[PDB]
Ligand binder design. Structure first.
Ligand code: CHL
Ligand code: CLA
Ligand code: CLA
Ligand code: CLA
Ligand code: CLA
Ligand code: CLA
Ligand code: CLA
Ligand code: CLA
Ligand code: CLA
Ligand SMILES: CC1=C(C/C=C(\C)CCC[C@H](C)CCC[C@H](C)CCCC(C)C)C(=O)c2ccccc2C1=O
Ligand SMILES: C[As](C)(=O)[O-]
Ligand SMILES: C[As](C)(=O)[O-]
Lengths: 739, 73, 210, 211, 41
């Protein structure tokens, strides 16, 4: 493995900008129709549509990566600079218990300054639910003078990132030999980018655990706290704080790791007074991650006859049923970028949702468990990002199968065996979805019917007839008895969501164990139903893309086409693009159901304020006998919790109601596109063009309606926009007035 | 739209508070709050664990309508 | 593929970062290429030598009775890394001295970069009558000239190659020495010469392990 | 290989060699590349120089008068205390200024688009004068002294006003930077530095001092 | 410079330059002139 770039492959000049659509020779000729602009936009990134030069495609991708990371770094710098210049971060820092986070202050123009909610700290502004103040408190920041320099560094790094992108595209454009170094790419991502970063961040958390764990949590004013450099160098300070220091760094040379117990500690749980977790656990976790990902990046033969490559491993895996498997998957990946992108996004969104699940019940920051709003925000954010990533992986799988695929050199018996029974899977998953729909949704119909017929003793209930799960409860039991029985060295359980010990900070309970009854059983079955239907849509789009039972010549029609023709009774939404279209709607449905379940569980059976005698939750435990019926979701959750979003015009939360109504509007607006076609619209444009030509004011570019694919794209775009925006406004206006 | 207008006009008129209409019929948040969210408490409470009443069948039909609407979609 | 014609070539490059295969096309391009790399290592050796002695000269010279004990101070306690220390009484303060050195050093450097980008371009333009001194040479690492080479040793090219390899060996050894000063000043927090006295007094007592 | 450049060794731009006064081949942003933008920017720089020189001269002379003992404010906050006790209101002064400057800046403008357009004799029958000798250097009436009727002397005398104006407009940025730090007159910053070079910059707020 | 000025006739120009001019003008008129809802006479 070596480096291979070329010098001045594309000269830097502003000419190719004057001709939009140059990358597509069909578009570069000229915009004779208004569809030209939309194709310019929908194809600028379609690198494999510009030309079949996979070298140029890899260069384009490796440059767009820096193009994205530059925006990422400018975004982080903007967040830090908002926190620095105008915010109550010092006020929040001196009193985190009651003061709320605010980092955006509006301009006085038309009365919008009412949005500057009174948050205290001698400053007014917009409350933020991103979670940056709690994240910064874990870094020993004492004053605003540090965030300025941090943002300066971030912005310099973003400038250097754009510089590196331009450099590797126009001055050091690599070759496919460098891009296809899977060995190097892995052993440097897995070992270097991950292991080295984890070790550095662990060493950081080790030498920053003084203020947060001891000084910040002892009423010491941040100005009173000695600066971090005063903690790092002076050995007397770190000897007074933690006795394990100033020993001489002896135990780490001879590996006699016995005396290092004051800063690498394993406790688990949290003090019902400290509010947050401790930095020693995170430091130990990051050292474990560093060691693990650093050793794992050393299991591949690269140059010096040490290890084993990926091709031999793929070749040495064959079985009786399949036979000659994994023949060319290495080439599958090294050939197309779409294959790698789909494989990544496959579990990338899944791990994002897993991070959401590991964050809502395990807040890894100080003074945020009582902040009932940031948890919901981050949880729902990451779950929607994961849903989009999974749907995008489903789309890029078919994308790979369309352009960059041929079962001759990339041949694999695994893939062709999957293809040869591509219909039994679809049929059986259809039957399973029917099963789940009649057995997870019909139960709600039965419950509504029983509650309406005047027979409450017959409805499904935790009191009339119980239908709660035990397997999840058995998992919680194995985790609860894990300490001292199956986890000797451990102190607490995995999470306080099933171990009692109601932890409360300032009335508000920081965490209370979560129950699992018939309602959770039904809602998890609904979740499984929706997820299986979404997977059905995506997989039936991916498989039936090269060939099908109806149209055999389906690969030549491409990936992005609306139909084939009104023949054989009618063909509509047959392309994998349309299956991704429908999978977006199903992912919306599933993620929405899951986030509503999360919100209503957390507000009914988890969150509340603790009085002298027990804890008084937000709602009076309305989750028990409302989730068993569809009307319950409108009885105590949707109807009840919507008072603030429609009653917030009197305060700084009116923008939430404005976004609420606007999202409803754009949703119905999307319905417009989704239910209509082009014939009507094209003829209406015809009559409008007639009206124009009478005064000689029509355009030279032929005004055509949107393409069918673009019509469906606009439909789904506005649809998800309205939906997600309405749900965002609701979950973000409801949770501020209850925390 | 015509039926919403007529209904909410005569609804503000029957409560003896036509000023409610004259003051809230100016924007859309009023239509959403003062009419849709407000005058539906008996639809939600037609049947509940406390016990149903004569308005339960009408609530179940109100849900049936939404089910048919979603099947249309 | 390391022919050995280069002065300080000994066949040591496991990474093989010097090969002509990298940077196939020709142009300004990047930094990983022999023309830049050997010149950069000679520059590093030159600075390292000029600093390796400059980091231990004041301290050794202070242990003796020639220089006043006032000025003799550790290389890292002179004003660089002012957290460690700052010599309080110069004729000017560190920031003023730093602006001075910025101006002077970047004249010196940028006039060196231009000659590397444009060989010999610095004698063309009238530069306060110092043009004949900046004519350069075939190898940019070794410009030479009237000022830079006011007397001459390498009249013969064999003796010249011997000189070059001696200079490069001393420079890379001094680069090792500089990196030795740094990490050694971190743990012990003491001048490089005092560590030699502390060791020679009790070698095993002042060795590397404890 | 024929004139001194700004960066010794760099290739001078191909759209400017030796015709413009004060030409050194310094243009990294490809400005004034087209003939029209260059004809604009030349006279723009010229007017910048001719205002910067007068401004810096007036500032330095008023400052020397103030330091010597004259009743002269400094260059800053001088329009504030000269307006408090003046017979001419503000606004009535501003629009008088703008009314007198529009009529002359307009004639200066339309002699750039078509030179010699002002010498037709419509304004008080002035024909020989008011004719643009070059891009931004008029003559006849603005040059009462016959000090431009020789190219050998003129090409050499005009190549130094651009330098003096560039230096003066760099000094004017010195006036602003040298006020937000010390809040003292420009001549005061000089005497406090020649009498004692130890009172150099980087000592009050030039560098951040958190430590 | 020439190709740059040509590039400055597309969406990233008026449509940005325009509507930036207009947003600025309207915001300034509503700022200096705080709350109009009827003409002077
Ligand atoms: C900074 C640029 C500046 C410029 C270009 C001018 C230009 C001018 N000033 Mg002015 N002023 C300027 C700054 C200032 N002035 C004044 C105070 C005055 C006075 C009091 C008067 C002028 C007058 C004039 C005009 C004299 C007419 C003529 O042909 O000569 C002229 C157009 C005179 C004028 O317009 O007379 C009719 C005049 O009487 N200026 C102050 C202090 C308030 C200034 C800055 O602080
Ligand atoms: C990360 C993206 C991002 C976003 C979405 C915003 C958004 C905003 N910024 Mg901001 N800013 C950012 C990054 C960002 N900024 C960065 C990286 C810096 C460092 C240079 C700044 C420095 C900055 C300052 C100094 C100010 C804002 C201000 C504003 C607000 C005024 C609107 C405006 O005209 O914006 C910009 C318009 C086009 C970019 C607005 C809500 C203003 C404000 O909020 O008033 C206090 C304000 O004056 N920003
Ligand atoms: C992540 C990289 C990293 C870096 C740059 C440093 C850097 C430093 N460490 Mg450290 N350390 C690290 C990781 C790191 N450490 C990790 C992962 C552990 C856990 C095993 C430790 C545990 C540790 C201890 C116990 C001590 C240091 C100390 C020090 C300082 C002097 C000792 C030395 O030079 O080493 C120094 C600035 C010493 C110190 O604090 O200086 C007085 C010291 O006592 N480190
Ligand atoms: C790193 C993530 C990533 C990347 C690099 C790409 C890259 C690409 N996508 Mg994709 N996409 C993603 C995530 C991603 N996508 C996700 C998460 C989804 C689910 C919503 C989609 C859904 C999607 C669809 C439906 C389509 C693409 C298409 C495309 C191609 C053209 C995009 C374009 O320029 O249109 C315009 C860009 C802005 C208007 C392009 C190579 C298009 C294609 O033709 O596939 C090749 C196409 O129609 N993507
Ligand atoms: C009220 C709205 C509504 C309803 C009820 C359904 C119902 C259903 N959809 Mg559908 N869908 C909808 C809206 C709706 N959808 C919209 C708006 C879209 C656009 C995105 C889609 C897109 C869509 C796709 C792409 C697919 C489905 C599929 C299905 C079926 C899944 C199998 C199942 O058991 O589910 C529930 C079963 C029932 C509700 C049947 C109830 C029977 C009653 C209670 C008994 C009455 C008997 C009486 C005595 C006589 C199911 C019958 C999938 C399918 O075809 O099966 C795999 C499928 O692939 N839907
Ligand atoms: C990069 C190399 C380097 C650097 C950064 C410095 C830097 C410095 N040297 Mg030094 N010096 C160097 C190389 C270097 N030296 C070498 C190679 C020698 C051998 C001749 C000396 C011999 C030397 C002497 C004799 C003295 C300095 C002194 C100084 C300090 C004051 C500078 C000055 O006197 O004017 C200053 C911090 C003064 C000093 O010792 O400060 C304590 C001084 O008296 N240097
Ligand atoms: C690599 C860092 C570096 C570099 C390139 C320089 C470079 C330079 N220093 Mg400096 N110096 C440094 C670090 C450095 N210094 C540090 C860390 C300190 C302690 C704070 C000093 C303290 C210092 C002093 C006191 C003086 C210099 C001076 C000088 C200049 C005189 C050199 C000469 O001709 O010798 C002869 C020169 C350009 C001298 C100067 O000002 O130049 C006229 C001088 O008086 N230096
Ligand atoms: C480490 C020992 C060492 C050795 C053996 C040399 C040897 C040489 N140097 Mg070098 N030099 C050194 C260190 C050394 N230098 C250091 C540390 C620096 C940093 C300042 C320089 C900076 C330097 C420059 C700038 C130049 C030389 C030049 C030369 C050559 C001309 C001198 C000569 O031989 O004529 C006899 C000398 C009688 C007094 C020569 C072969 C010249 C050259 O490279 O020729 C092309 C030249 O331009 N040297
Ligand atoms: C068409 C858009 C537009 C217009 C017409 C204006 C007009 C004006 N702006 Mg404004 N501005 C705009 C856009 C605009 N701005 C935008 C987009 C921003 C965001 C960067 C600003 C930010 C801004 C600031 C910060 C300030 C102005 C100021 C001013 C006033 C100074 C002019 C003056 O009084 O001199 C003389 C006029 C006649 C002799 C002026 C009336 C200044 C002001 O408020 O006036 C004191 C000022 O402080 N503007
Ligand atoms: C209305 C409609 C259209 C027509 C869509 C149109 C005409 C979109 C055009 C709207 C854009 C936003 C026009 C804007 C362009 C302006 C002329 C210039 C931009 C303004 C500047 C300030 C930027 C479809 O193409 C369609 C397709 C399939 C199903 C349903 C439908 C459908 O309902
Ligand atoms: C370096 As010699 C020629 O004096 O040996
Ligand atoms: C700073 As020490 C000499 O105690 O390692």
């Amino acid at each position: 493995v070596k480096i291979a770039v070329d010098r001045n492959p594309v000269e830097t000049n502003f000419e190719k900008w004057a001709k939009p659509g140059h990358f597509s020779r069909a578009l570069a000729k000229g915009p004779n129709t208004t569809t030209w602009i939309w194709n310019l936009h929908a194809d600028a990134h379609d690198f494999d549509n510009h030309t079949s030069d996979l070298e140029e495609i890899s260069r384009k991708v490796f440059s767009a990566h820096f193009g994205q990371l530059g925006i990422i770094l400018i975004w982080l710098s903007g967040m830090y600079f908002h926190g620095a210049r105008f915010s109550n971060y010092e006020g929040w820092l001196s009193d985190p218990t009651h003061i709320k986070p605010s980092a955006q202050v509006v301009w006085p123009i038309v009365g919008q300054e009412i949005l500057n909610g009174d948050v205290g700290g001698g400053f007014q502004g917009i409350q933020i639910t991103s979670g940056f103040f709690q994240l910064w408190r874990a870094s020993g920041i004492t004053s605003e003078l540090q965030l300025y320099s941090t943002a300066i560094g971030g912005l310099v790094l973003a400038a250097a990132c754009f510089f590196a992108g331009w450099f590797h595209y126009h001055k050091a454009a690599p070759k496919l030999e460098w891009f296809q170094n899977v060995e190097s790419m892995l052993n440097h991502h897995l070992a270097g980018l991950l292991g080295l970063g984890s070790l550095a961040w662990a060493g950081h958390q080790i030498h920053v655990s003084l203020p947060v764990n001891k000084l910040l949590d002892a009423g010491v004013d941040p100005k009173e706290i000695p600066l971090p450099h005063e903690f790092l160098l002076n050995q007397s300070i770190i000897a007074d704080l933690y006795p394990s220091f100033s020993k001489g760094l002896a135990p780490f040379f001879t590996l006699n790791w016995a005396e290092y117990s004051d800063f690498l500690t394993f406790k688990g749980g949290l003090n019902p007074v400290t509010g947050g977790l401790w930095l020693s656990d995170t430091a130990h976790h990051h050292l474990a991650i560093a060691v693990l990902f650093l050793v794992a990046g050393h299991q591949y033969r690269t140059n010096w006859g040490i290890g084993h490559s990926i091709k031999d491993i793929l070749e040495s895996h064959k079985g009786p049923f399949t036979g000659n498997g994994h023949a060319g998957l290495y080439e599958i990946l090294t050939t197309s970028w779409h294959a790698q992108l789909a494989i990544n996004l496959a579990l990338f969104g899944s791990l994002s949702i897993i991070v959401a699940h590991h964050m809502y019940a395990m807040p890894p920051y100080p003074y945020l468990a009582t902040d009932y709003g940031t948890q919901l925000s981050l949880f729902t954010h990451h779950m929607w990002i994961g849903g989009f990533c999974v749907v995008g992986a489903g789309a890029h799988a078919a994308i790979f199968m369309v352009r960059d695929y041929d079962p001759t050199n990339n041949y694999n018996n695994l893939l062709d065996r999957v293809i040869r029974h591509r219909d039994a899977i679809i049929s059986h998953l259809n039957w399973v979805s029917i099963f789940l729909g009649f057995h997870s949704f019909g139960l709600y119909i039965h419950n509504d019917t029983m509650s309406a017929l005047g027979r409450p003793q017959d409805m499904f209930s935790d009191t009339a007839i119980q239908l709660q799960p035990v397997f999840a409860q058995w998992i919680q039991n194995t985790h609860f008895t894990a300490p001292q029985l199956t986890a000797p060295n451990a102190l607490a359980a995995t999470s306080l969501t099933w171990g009692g010990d109601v932890v409360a900070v300032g009335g508000k309970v920081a965490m209370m164990p979560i129950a699992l009854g018939t309602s959770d059983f039904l809602v998890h079955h609904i979740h499984a139903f929706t997820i299986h239907v979404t997977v059905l849509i995506l997989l039936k789009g991916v498989l039936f893309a090269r060939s099908s039972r109806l149209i055999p010549d389906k690969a030549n029609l491409g990936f992005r086409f609306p139909c084939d023709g009104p023949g054989r009774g009618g063909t509509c939404q047959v392309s994998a693009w349309d299956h991704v279209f429908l999978g977006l709607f199903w992912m919306y449905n599933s993620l929405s159901i899951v986030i509503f379940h999360f919100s209503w569980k957390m507000q009914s059976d988890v969150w509340g304020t603790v009085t002298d005698s027990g804890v008084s939750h937000i709602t009076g435990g309305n989750f028990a006998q409302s989730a068993n019926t569809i009307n319950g979701w409108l009885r105590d959750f949707l109807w009840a919790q919507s008072s603030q979003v429609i009653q917030s015009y009197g305060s700084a939360l009116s923008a939430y109601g404005l976004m609420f109504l606007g999202a409803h509007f754009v949703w119905a607006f999307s319905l417009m596109f989704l239910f209509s076609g082009r014939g009507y619209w094209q003829e209406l444009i015809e009559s409008i063009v007639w009206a124009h030509n009478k005064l000689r004011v029509a355009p030279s570019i032929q005004p055509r309606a949107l393409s069918i694919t673009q019509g469906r794209a606009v439909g789904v775009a506005h649809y998800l926009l309205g939906g997600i925006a309405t749900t965002w406004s609701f979950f973000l206006a409801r949770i501020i007035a209850v925390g | 739209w015509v039926t919403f207008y007529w209904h909410w006009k005569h609804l503000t008129l029957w409560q003896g508070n036509v000023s409610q209409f004259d003051e809230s019929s100016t924007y859309l948040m009023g239509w959403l709050r003062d009419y849709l969210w407000l005058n539906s408490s008996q639809l939600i409470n037609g049947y509940n664990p406390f016990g149903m009443n004569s308005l339960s069948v009408w609530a179940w039909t109100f849900l049936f309508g939404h089910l048919v609407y979603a099947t249309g979609f | 593929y390391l022919d050995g014609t280069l002065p300080g070539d000994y066949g040591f490059d496991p990474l093989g970062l010097l090969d002509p295969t990298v940077s196939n096309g020709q142009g300004a391009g990047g930094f990983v290429n022999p023309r830049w790399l050997q010149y950069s290592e000679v520059i590093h050796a030159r600075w390292a030598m000029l600093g390796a002695a400059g980091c231990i000269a004041p301290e050794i010279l202070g242990k003796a009775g020639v220089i006043p004990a006032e000025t003799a101070v550790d290389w890292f306690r002179t004003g660089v890394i002012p957290p460690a220390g700052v010599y309080k009484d110069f004729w000017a303060d560190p920031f003023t001295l730093f602006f001075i050195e910025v101006v002077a050093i970047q004249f010196a450097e940028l006039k060196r970069l231009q000659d590397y980008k444009n060989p010999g371009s610095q004698s063309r333009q009238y530069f306060l009558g110092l043009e004949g001194l900046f004519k350069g040479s075939d190898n940019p690492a070794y410009p030479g000239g009237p000022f830079f080479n006011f007397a001459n040793f390498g009249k013969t090219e064999a003796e010249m190659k011997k000189l070059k390899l001696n200079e490069i060996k001393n420079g890379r050894l001094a680069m090792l020495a500089m990196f030795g000063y740094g990490a050694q000043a971190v743990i012990t927090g003491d001048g490089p010469f005092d560590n030699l006295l502390a060791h020679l007094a009790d070698p095993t007592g002042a060795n590397l392990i404890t | 290989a024929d004139r001194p450049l700004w960066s010794p060794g760099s290739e001078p731009p191909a759209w400017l060699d030796g015709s413009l006064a004060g030409d050194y081949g310094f243009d990294p942003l490809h400005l004034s590349e087209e003939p029209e933008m260059r004809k604009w920017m030349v006279q723009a720089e010229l007017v910048h120089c001719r205002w910067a020189m007068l401004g810096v001269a007036g500032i330095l002379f008023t400052s020397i008068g103030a330091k010597a003992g004259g009743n002269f404010p400094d260059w800053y906050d001088a329009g504030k205390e000269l307006q408090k006790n003046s017979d001419i209101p503000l606004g009535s002064l501003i629009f008088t200024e703008l009314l007198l400057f529009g009529w002359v800046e307009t004639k200066r403008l339309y002699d750039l688009r078509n030179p010699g357009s002002q010498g037709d004799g419509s304004f008080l029958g002035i024909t020989d004068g008011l004719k643009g000798k070059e891009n931004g250097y008029p003559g006849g009436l603005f040059d009462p002294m016959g000090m431009s009727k020789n190219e050998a002397s003129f090409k050499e005398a005009k190549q130094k006003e651009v330098k003096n104006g560039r230096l003066a407009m760099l000094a004017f940025v010195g006036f602003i930077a040298q006020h937000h730090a010390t809040h003292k007159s420009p001549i005061d910053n000089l005497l406090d530095h020649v009498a004692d070079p130890f009172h150099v910059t980087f000592a009050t707020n030039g560098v951040s001092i958190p430590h | 410079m020439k190709d740059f000025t040509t590039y400055l006739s597309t969406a990233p120009v008026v449509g940005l330059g325009w509507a930036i001019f207009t947003s600025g003008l309207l915001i300034e008129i509503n700022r200096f002139f705080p709350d109009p809802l009827v003409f002077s006479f």
